[PDB]
Amino acid sequence: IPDLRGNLRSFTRQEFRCVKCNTKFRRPPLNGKCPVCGGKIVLTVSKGAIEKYLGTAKMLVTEYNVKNYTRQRICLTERDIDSLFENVFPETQLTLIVNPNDICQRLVMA
């Protein structure tokens, strides 16, 4: 949980860097490419860094007897990760089957 929450918080106040030099900018250039350089601009907190431990956390919440506080914390964290990227990575791909043994949906439905 500390890693999930810390990486999620640190994503919204990061510092973009140039891949050729090592100069770091507070906010990305409007042009889109590093001025005074011939390289692109990269992230320092990738999207995959936030959600690397989400699967194991969901397994731990769904397989064992933990207090409701922690279960709700994880179930809100998943929603918060999903909701931040709604306008950049829309859910465009449909799925053939549903209900992958989710605990968040079951808790909400109950």
What does the binding site for DNA look like in residue numbers (CB under 7 A)?
Answer: 1-3, 5-7, 9-10, 14-15, 17, 19, 22, 24, 40, 42, 44-49, 52
Q: Euclidean distance between the first and final Cα of the chain, in Å?
A: 24
The mark string for 24-63 relative to another protein (x by CB under 8 A, - otherwise) is --xxxxxxx--x----xxxx--xxx---------------
Closest CA to 12 of 71, 67, 76, 80: 80
Measure the CA–CA gap between 26 and 106, rounded to whole angstroms: 41
- Residue count, binding to another protein (CB under 8 A): 46
The mark string for 61-90 relative to another protein (x by CB under 8 A, - otherwise) is -------xx--xx--x--xx--xxx-xxxx
Measure the CA–CA gap between 22 and 24, rounded to whole angstroms: 6
Q: What angle do CA 59, 64, 67 make, to 5 degrees?
A: 105
Residues within the interface to another protein (CB under 8 A): 5, 8-9, 12-16, 26-32, 35, 40-43, 46-48, 68-69, 72-73, 76, 79-80, 83-85, 87-90, 92-98, 100, 108
